[PDB]
Coordinates of C-alpha atoms and ligand atoms in Angstrom, one line a residue:
Chain A
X14 CA -24.1 5.9 3.4
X15 CA -25.9 8.9 2.4
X16 CA -27.2 8.2 -1.0
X17 CA -25.2 5.2 -1.2
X18 CA -22.5 7.3 -2.6
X19 CA -18.9 7.6 -1.3
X20 CA -16.6 10.3 -2.7
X21 CA -13.1 9.2 -3.7
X22 CA -11.2 12.3 -2.9
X23 CA -7.9 11.9 -5.0
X24 CA -7.1 15.6 -5.8
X25 CA -3.6 16.4 -4.5
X26 CA -4.0 19.9 -3.4
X27 CA -5.8 20.9 -0.2
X28 CA -7.6 23.8 -1.6
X29 CA -9.1 21.9 -4.7
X30 CA -9.8 18.9 -2.3
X31 CA -11.8 21.2 0.3
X32 CA -13.6 23.0 -2.5
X33 CA -14.8 19.9 -4.3
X34 CA -15.8 18.1 -1.1
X35 CA -17.7 21.3 0.2
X36 CA -19.4 21.4 -3.1
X37 CA -20.7 17.8 -3.0
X38 CA -21.3 17.5 0.9
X39 CA -25.1 17.7 0.6
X40 CA -25.1 14.5 -1.4
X41 CA -22.5 12.3 0.5
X42 CA -21.8 11.6 4.1
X43 CA -18.6 9.4 3.6
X44 CA -15.4 10.5 1.9
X45 CA -12.7 8.1 1.0
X46 CA -9.1 9.6 1.4
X47 CA -6.1 7.9 0.0
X48 CA -2.4 8.3 -0.4
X49 CA -2.6 10.9 -3.4
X50 CA -4.1 13.5 -1.0
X51 CA -2.3 12.3 2.3
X52 CA 1.2 12.2 0.7
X53 CA 0.7 15.7 -0.7
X54 CA -0.9 17.4 2.3
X55 CA -0.3 15.3 5.3
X56 CA -2.2 12.9 7.7
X57 CA -3.6 16.0 9.4
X58 CA -6.0 16.3 6.3
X59 CA -8.0 13.5 7.7
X60 CA -9.0 15.3 10.9
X61 CA -9.5 18.5 8.9
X62 CA -12.1 16.8 6.7
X63 CA -13.9 15.0 9.5
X64 CA -14.2 18.4 11.4
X65 CA -15.1 20.8 8.3
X66 CA -17.7 18.4 6.9
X67 CA -18.8 16.0 9.6
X68 CA -18.3 13.1 7.3
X69 CA -17.1 9.5 7.9
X70 CA -13.6 9.1 6.4
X71 CA -12.5 5.8 4.9
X72 CA -8.5 5.7 4.5
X73 CA -7.9 4.1 1.3
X74 CA -4.3 2.9 2.1
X75 CA -4.5 -0.5 0.3
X76 CA -2.6 -1.9 3.3
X77 CA -0.4 -4.7 2.0
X78 CA 2.7 -5.3 4.1
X79 CA 3.7 -7.8 6.8
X80 CA 1.7 -8.1 10.1
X81 CA 4.0 -5.9 12.3
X82 CA 4.0 -3.1 9.8
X83 CA 0.3 -3.4 9.0
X84 CA -0.3 -2.8 12.8
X85 CA 1.7 0.4 12.7
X86 CA 0.0 1.6 9.6
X87 CA -3.4 1.0 11.1
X88 CA -2.3 2.7 14.4
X89 CA -1.2 5.8 12.7
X90 CA -4.2 6.0 10.5
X91 CA -6.8 5.6 13.4
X92 CA -4.8 8.1 15.5
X93 CA -5.1 10.5 12.6
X94 CA -9.0 10.1 13.0
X95 CA -9.9 7.8 10.1
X96 CA -13.1 5.7 10.8
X97 CA -12.0 2.9 8.7
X98 CA -9.0 1.6 6.6
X99 CA -9.0 -0.4 3.4
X100 CA -6.6 -3.6 3.6
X101 CA -5.6 -6.0 1.0
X102 CA -6.3 -9.5 1.4
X103 CA -3.7 -10.9 -1.1
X104 CA -0.9 -10.9 1.6
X105 CA -2.9 -13.4 3.6
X106 CA -4.6 -14.1 6.9
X107 CA -2.0 -12.9 9.5
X108 CA -1.6 -9.4 7.7
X109 CA -5.4 -9.0 7.8
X110 CA -5.8 -10.1 11.3
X111 CA -3.1 -7.5 12.4
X112 CA -5.2 -4.8 11.1
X113 CA -8.3 -6.4 12.7
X114 CA -6.7 -6.3 16.0
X115 CA -5.8 -2.7 15.8
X116 CA -9.3 -1.8 14.6
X117 CA -10.5 -3.7 17.6
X118 CA -8.5 -1.9 20.0
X119 CA -9.4 1.5 18.7
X120 CA -13.1 1.0 18.2
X121 CA -12.7 1.2 14.2
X122 CA -13.4 -0.7 11.1
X123 CA -11.4 -2.6 8.4
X124 CA -12.7 -2.9 4.8
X125 CA -11.1 -6.0 3.0
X126 CA -10.3 -5.3 -0.7
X127 CA -11.0 -8.6 -2.5
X128 CA -10.9 -8.2 -6.2
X129 CA -9.6 -4.9 -7.7
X130 CA -11.4 -3.0 -10.5
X131 CA -8.5 -2.3 -13.2
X132 CA -7.5 -4.6 -16.0
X133 CA -4.4 -5.9 -14.4
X134 CA -6.7 -7.4 -11.5
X135 CA -7.2 -10.2 -14.1
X136 CA -3.7 -11.3 -13.8
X137 CA -3.3 -12.5 -10.3
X138 CA -5.9 -11.1 -8.0
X139 CA -9.0 -12.4 -9.8
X140 CA -8.0 -16.0 -9.5
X141 CA -7.6 -15.5 -5.6
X142 CA -10.4 -13.2 -5.1
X143 CA -13.1 -15.8 -4.0
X144 CA -10.6 -17.4 -1.4
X145 CA -9.7 -14.0 -0.2
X146 CA -13.3 -13.2 0.4
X147 CA -13.7 -16.7 2.1
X148 CA -10.8 -15.7 4.3
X149 CA -12.4 -12.5 5.2
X150 CA -15.6 -14.5 6.3
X151 CA -13.5 -16.8 8.4
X152 CA -11.7 -13.9 10.2
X153 CA -15.0 -12.1 11.0
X154 CA -14.5 -9.3 8.4
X155 CA -17.9 -7.5 7.9
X156 CA -17.0 -4.7 5.4
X157 CA -15.6 -5.5 1.8
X158 CA -14.6 -3.9 -1.4
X159 CA -15.0 -5.3 -4.9
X160 CA -15.1 -4.1 -8.5
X161 CA -17.9 -2.1 -10.3
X162 CA -16.2 -2.9 -13.5
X163 CA -17.1 -6.6 -13.1
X164 CA -20.5 -7.0 -11.8
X165 CA -20.8 -10.8 -12.3
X166 CA -17.7 -10.9 -9.9
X167 CA -19.5 -8.4 -7.6
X168 CA -22.3 -11.0 -7.5
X169 CA -20.0 -13.8 -6.8
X170 CA -18.4 -11.8 -3.9
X171 CA -21.9 -10.9 -2.6
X172 CA -22.8 -14.5 -2.7
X173 CA -19.7 -15.4 -0.4
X174 CA -19.9 -12.6 2.1
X175 CA -23.7 -12.8 2.5
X176 CA -26.4 -10.1 2.8
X177 CA -25.5 -8.7 6.2
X178 CA -21.9 -7.7 5.3
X179 CA -21.4 -4.3 3.9
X180 CA -19.9 -4.0 0.4
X181 CA -18.7 -0.9 -1.4
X182 CA -17.3 -0.8 -5.0
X183 CA -15.1 1.5 -7.0
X184 CA -14.6 1.7 -10.7
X185 CA -17.8 3.6 -11.4
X186 CA -17.8 6.3 -14.1
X187 CA -14.2 6.7 -15.4
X188 CA -13.2 3.1 -15.2
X189 CA -16.4 2.2 -16.9
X190 CA -18.7 0.8 -14.2
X191 CA -22.5 1.7 -13.9
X192 CA -24.1 3.0 -10.7
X193 CA -27.3 1.2 -11.0
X194 CA -25.8 -2.2 -12.1
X195 CA -23.2 -1.9 -9.3
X196 CA -26.0 -1.2 -6.7
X197 CA -27.6 -4.5 -7.5
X198 CA -24.8 -6.2 -5.5
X199 CA -23.0 -3.2 -3.5
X200 CA -24.4 -1.3 -0.7
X201 CA -22.6 1.8 -1.9
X202 CA -20.5 3.0 -4.8
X203 CA -17.3 4.9 -4.7
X204 CA -16.9 7.8 -7.3
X205 CA -13.8 9.8 -7.9
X206 CA -13.0 11.4 -11.2
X207 CA -16.6 11.4 -12.6
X208 CA -17.4 14.0 -9.8
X209 CA -14.0 15.7 -8.9
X210 CA -12.8 16.3 -12.6
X211 CA -16.3 17.5 -13.6
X212 CA -16.9 21.2 -14.5
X213 CA -19.6 21.1 -11.9
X214 CA -19.0 18.3 -9.3
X215 CA -22.3 19.0 -7.4
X216 CA -24.1 18.5 -10.8
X217 CA -22.2 15.4 -11.5
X218 CA -23.0 13.9 -8.0
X219 CA -26.7 15.0 -8.2
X220 CA -26.8 13.3 -11.6
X221 CA -25.5 10.0 -10.1
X222 CA -27.9 10.3 -7.1
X223 CA -30.7 10.8 -9.6
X224 CA -29.9 7.7 -11.5
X225 CA -29.6 6.0 -8.1
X226 CA -33.0 7.1 -6.5
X227 CA -34.7 5.2 -9.4
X228 CA -33.3 1.9 -8.2
Chain B
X14 CA 24.9 -0.6 -1.1
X15 CA 27.6 0.0 1.5
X16 CA 28.3 -3.2 3.3
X17 CA 25.3 -4.8 1.4
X18 CA 23.1 -3.7 4.3
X19 CA 20.0 -1.5 4.1
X20 CA 18.4 0.0 7.3
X21 CA 14.6 -0.5 7.4
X22 CA 13.6 2.6 9.6
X23 CA 10.3 1.8 10.9
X24 CA 10.5 3.8 14.2
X25 CA 7.6 6.2 14.3
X26 CA 9.2 9.2 16.0
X27 CA 11.4 11.6 14.3
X28 CA 13.8 12.0 17.2
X29 CA 14.3 8.3 17.7
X30 CA 14.5 7.6 13.9
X31 CA 17.2 10.3 13.5
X32 CA 19.2 9.2 16.4
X33 CA 19.3 5.4 15.4
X34 CA 20.0 6.3 11.6
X35 CA 22.8 8.8 12.7
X36 CA 24.3 5.9 15.0
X37 CA 24.5 3.4 12.2
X38 CA 25.3 5.7 9.2
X39 CA 29.0 4.6 9.1
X40 CA 27.8 1.0 8.1
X41 CA 24.9 1.7 5.6
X42 CA 24.4 4.2 2.7
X43 CA 20.7 3.3 1.9
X44 CA 17.8 3.6 4.3
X45 CA 14.4 2.2 3.5
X46 CA 11.6 4.5 4.9
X47 CA 8.1 3.2 4.9
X48 CA 4.6 4.4 6.0
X49 CA 5.1 3.9 9.7
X50 CA 7.5 6.8 9.7
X51 CA 5.9 8.8 7.0
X52 CA 2.4 8.6 8.3
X53 CA 3.8 9.6 11.8
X54 CA 6.2 12.5 10.8
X55 CA 5.3 13.4 7.2
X56 CA 6.8 13.2 3.7
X57 CA 9.3 16.0 4.5
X58 CA 11.1 13.3 6.6
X59 CA 12.5 11.8 3.4
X60 CA 14.3 14.9 2.3
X61 CA 15.5 15.5 5.9
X62 CA 17.1 12.1 5.8
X63 CA 18.6 12.6 2.5
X64 CA 20.1 15.9 3.5
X65 CA 21.4 14.9 7.0
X66 CA 22.8 11.6 6.2
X67 CA 23.6 11.9 2.4
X68 CA 22.1 8.3 2.1
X69 CA 20.0 6.9 -0.9
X70 CA 16.3 6.5 0.3
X71 CA 14.0 3.7 -0.8
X72 CA 10.4 4.6 -0.1
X73 CA 8.7 1.3 1.1
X74 CA 5.2 2.2 0.1
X75 CA 4.1 -1.3 -1.1
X76 CA 2.4 0.5 -3.9
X77 CA -0.8 -1.7 -4.7
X78 CA -3.5 0.4 -6.4
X79 CA -5.0 1.0 -9.9
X80 CA -2.7 2.6 -12.6
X81 CA -3.9 6.1 -12.2
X82 CA -3.5 6.0 -8.4
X83 CA -0.1 4.4 -8.6
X84 CA 1.0 7.2 -10.9
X85 CA -0.1 9.8 -8.2
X86 CA 1.7 7.9 -5.3
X87 CA 5.0 7.6 -7.4
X88 CA 4.8 11.3 -8.4
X89 CA 4.3 12.4 -4.7
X90 CA 7.0 10.1 -3.6
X91 CA 9.7 11.2 -6.0
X92 CA 8.8 14.8 -5.5
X93 CA 9.6 14.3 -1.9
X94 CA 13.0 13.2 -2.8
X95 CA 12.9 9.5 -2.7
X96 CA 15.4 7.6 -4.8
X97 CA 13.4 4.6 -5.4
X98 CA 9.9 3.0 -4.5
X99 CA 8.9 -0.5 -3.8
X100 CA 5.8 -1.7 -5.8
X101 CA 3.7 -4.7 -5.5
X102 CA 3.5 -7.0 -8.5
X103 CA 0.3 -8.7 -7.4
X104 CA -1.9 -6.0 -9.0
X105 CA -0.7 -6.8 -12.4
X106 CA 1.4 -5.2 -15.2
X107 CA -0.6 -2.3 -16.0
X108 CA -0.1 -1.1 -12.2
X109 CA 3.6 -1.7 -12.4
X110 CA 4.0 -0.1 -15.7
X111 CA 2.3 2.9 -14.3
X112 CA 5.1 3.2 -11.6
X113 CA 7.7 2.7 -14.2
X114 CA 6.4 5.3 -16.3
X115 CA 6.7 7.8 -13.6
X116 CA 10.2 6.7 -12.6
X117 CA 11.2 7.1 -16.3
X118 CA 10.0 10.5 -16.1
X119 CA 11.7 11.6 -13.1
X120 CA 14.9 9.8 -13.3
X121 CA 14.3 7.5 -10.5
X122 CA 13.9 3.5 -9.9
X123 CA 11.1 1.1 -9.1
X124 CA 11.8 -2.2 -7.1
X125 CA 9.3 -4.9 -7.7
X126 CA 8.1 -6.8 -4.6
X127 CA 7.7 -10.4 -5.8
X128 CA 7.3 -12.7 -2.8
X129 CA 6.7 -11.4 0.8
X130 CA 8.7 -12.7 3.8
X131 CA 5.9 -13.4 6.4
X132 CA 3.9 -16.5 6.9
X133 CA 0.7 -15.4 5.2
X134 CA 2.7 -14.8 2.0
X135 CA 2.2 -18.6 1.4
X136 CA -1.4 -18.3 1.0
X137 CA -1.8 -16.4 -2.2
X138 CA 1.5 -14.4 -3.0
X139 CA 3.9 -17.4 -3.3
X140 CA 1.8 -19.2 -5.9
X141 CA 1.9 -16.0 -8.1
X142 CA 5.5 -15.0 -7.3
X143 CA 7.3 -16.7 -10.2
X144 CA 5.0 -15.2 -12.7
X145 CA 5.2 -11.8 -11.0
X146 CA 9.0 -12.0 -11.3
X147 CA 8.7 -13.1 -15.0
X148 CA 6.3 -10.1 -15.6
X149 CA 8.9 -7.8 -14.1
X150 CA 11.6 -9.3 -16.5
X151 CA 9.2 -8.7 -19.4
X152 CA 8.4 -5.0 -18.3
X153 CA 12.1 -4.3 -18.0
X154 CA 12.3 -3.9 -14.2
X155 CA 15.8 -4.3 -13.0
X156 CA 15.3 -4.1 -9.2
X157 CA 13.4 -6.7 -7.3
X158 CA 12.6 -7.7 -3.6
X159 CA 12.2 -11.2 -2.3
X160 CA 12.2 -13.0 1.1
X161 CA 15.1 -13.8 3.4
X162 CA 12.8 -16.2 5.1
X163 CA 12.7 -18.6 2.2
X164 CA 16.1 -18.8 0.5
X165 CA 15.0 -21.6 -1.8
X166 CA 12.4 -19.1 -3.1
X167 CA 15.1 -16.3 -3.1
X168 CA 17.3 -18.8 -5.4
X169 CA 14.3 -19.4 -7.8
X170 CA 13.7 -15.6 -8.0
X171 CA 17.4 -14.8 -8.7
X172 CA 17.2 -17.7 -11.4
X173 CA 14.2 -15.9 -13.2
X174 CA 15.7 -12.3 -12.9
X175 CA 19.2 -13.3 -13.9
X176 CA 22.6 -12.1 -12.5
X177 CA 22.5 -8.4 -13.7
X178 CA 19.2 -7.6 -11.8
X179 CA 19.5 -6.1 -8.3
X180 CA 17.8 -8.0 -5.6
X181 CA 17.2 -6.9 -1.9
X182 CA 15.7 -8.9 0.8
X183 CA 13.9 -8.3 3.9
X184 CA 13.1 -10.8 6.9
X185 CA 16.7 -11.0 8.2
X186 CA 17.0 -11.2 12.0
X187 CA 13.4 -10.6 13.6
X188 CA 11.6 -12.6 11.1
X189 CA 14.1 -15.4 11.2
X190 CA 16.3 -14.9 7.9
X191 CA 20.2 -15.2 8.1
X192 CA 22.3 -12.6 6.7
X193 CA 24.9 -14.8 5.0
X194 CA 22.4 -17.2 3.7
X195 CA 20.4 -14.5 2.1
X196 CA 23.4 -12.8 0.6
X197 CA 24.1 -16.1 -1.4
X198 CA 21.2 -15.0 -3.7
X199 CA 20.3 -11.2 -2.8
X200 CA 22.6 -8.2 -3.4
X201 CA 21.7 -6.6 -0.2
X202 CA 19.7 -7.3 3.0
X203 CA 17.2 -5.3 4.6
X204 CA 17.3 -5.2 8.4
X205 CA 14.9 -3.3 10.7
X206 CA 14.2 -4.3 14.3
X207 CA 17.4 -6.4 14.8
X208 CA 19.1 -2.9 14.5
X209 CA 16.7 -0.3 15.6
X210 CA 15.3 -2.2 18.7
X211 CA 18.9 -3.2 19.8
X212 CA 20.3 -1.7 22.9
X213 CA 23.2 -0.4 20.8
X214 CA 22.1 -0.3 17.1
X215 CA 25.7 0.5 16.0
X216 CA 26.9 -2.8 17.6
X217 CA 24.0 -4.7 16.1
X218 CA 24.8 -3.2 12.6
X219 CA 28.5 -3.9 13.0
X220 CA 27.9 -7.4 14.1
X221 CA 25.9 -8.1 11.1
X222 CA 28.6 -6.5 8.7
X223 CA 31.2 -8.7 10.6
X224 CA 29.2 -11.9 9.7
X225 CA 28.9 -10.4 6.1
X226 CA 32.6 -9.5 5.5
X227 CA 33.3 -13.3 6.0
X228 CA 31.2 -14.0 3.0
Ligands
LIG301 N1 -8.9 1.2 -3.8 C1 -9.4 1.0 -5.1 C2 -9.4 -0.4 -5.3 C3 -9.9 -0.8 -6.6 O1 -9.9 -2.1 -6.9 N2 -10.2 0.1 -7.5 C4 -10.1 1.4 -7.3 O2 -10.3 2.3 -8.0 N3 -9.7 1.9 -6.0 C5 -9.7 3.3 -5.7 O3 -11.1 3.8 -5.8 C6 -11.0 5.2 -6.5 C7 -11.6 5.1 -7.9 O4 -11.7 6.4 -8.3 P1 -12.2 6.7 -9.8 O5 -11.8 5.8 -10.8 O6 -13.7 6.9 -9.7 O7 -11.5 8.1 -10.1 C8 -9.5 5.6 -6.6 O8 -9.2 6.2 -5.3 C9 -8.8 4.2 -6.7 O9 -7.4 4.4 -6.0
LIG302 N1 8.3 -4.4 2.5 C1 8.5 -5.6 3.1 C2 8.2 -6.8 2.3 C3 8.3 -8.1 2.7 O1 8.1 -9.0 2.2 N2 8.8 -8.3 4.2 C4 9.3 -7.0 4.7 O2 9.5 -7.3 5.9 N3 9.0 -5.8 4.5 C5 9.4 -4.6 5.2 O3 10.8 -4.9 5.5 C6 11.0 -4.5 6.9 C7 11.6 -5.8 7.6 O4 11.9 -5.2 8.9 P1 12.3 -6.1 10.0 O5 11.5 -7.3 10.1 O6 13.9 -6.4 9.9 O7 12.1 -5.4 11.2 C8 9.8 -3.7 7.3 O8 9.9 -2.4 6.9 C9 8.8 -4.5 6.5 O9 7.7 -3.7 6.4

């Protein structure tokens, strides 16, 4: 990913989302779009972004249903032009395999979310996260998401998935994570509010990239 | 809920979704709409259904993100006219409280999903489900979802949440659950494919209601 930085575009207005992404485009080449933007503006926003910016799009849909429904969600998401989808591992292996099957059929990718970045992840998810990551390895998952807010957990995840898997990490900036520390273990960092709520998003992105280039 | 039956409308085409819901409307008064329909047809389909059928709409969005994102998802979902939203408990209490806060602000309801109905739920979710339900009780959640496919787990959930909480249950029909057994513990059952894939959905719904009225 360009500069190892993925923009989390969670503004809920098409005009604002387009303006901020355009302003930071020279620093990124992957945008993560989630339900805040899609539920406000529609699935067509994915193809619009892909066309206007020529970026890769990761659909952060935190997919977390039964296998049949997960299949339908993945099929709608890739039909809309997303390059990859983020899927929860907590619902178990059949739910994840449903997503992997559709990604195989459509030439796309699944990212497995293993431990979440927020405080509540400590309640249930963290205790399952090593096993979720091991399940990923055993299903042949090659792309993973783990938390910037806990780099010792990010280290342990990297250890489970090995050096050839690709690992991206949210929770940088607003949630407390550090870019440079997170990039010791992740291949790329995801940044939302620290860029898109900034008075000058391009300067915010540039400042992050500057602290990165040093590593 | 009319006849204790909620239709899970997971067809992905507006025309087919409208036709089946119209055909079964005399038997239900609550429709659960999830991402298969919304990601195909847009969020406007919720208001369309609410207007055309005068039903209550539960948005099955399996919400499973960090608190800030959950807030945004809930706000978009209620702005679109949904009466209630389904939220995962696995991400922990802060994520659930974010949804409860928005439902309080907008005069709407949250359903907490506690154990899922599919086989993979046995891997991680089932081991956490009693505690997720207890967390719900301690947050003041009054509406819950638990699995028709495991009525001994549905009994244990009912025991945790008490008799005054409202409990709805998917996995009836296609996934193997039985209407009458599930209604020993749940207030209402959710049915999707057994109705909407039937040659005659009205006859399928009627046949279910007939086996219900007996209880
Ligand atoms: N999918 C996620 C899983 C996760 O564990 N934490 C996380 O923040 N996210 C998403 O990453 C982004 C973090 O953005 P920010 O905290 O940098 O604003 C938001 O889209 C979150 O929904
Ligand atoms: N949200 C759900 C949680 C769950 O545990 N199981 C379940 O099937 N669902 C949903 O209920 C419906 C079950 O439909 P069917 O199996 O009756 O076709 C589908 O919308 C599933 O996504």
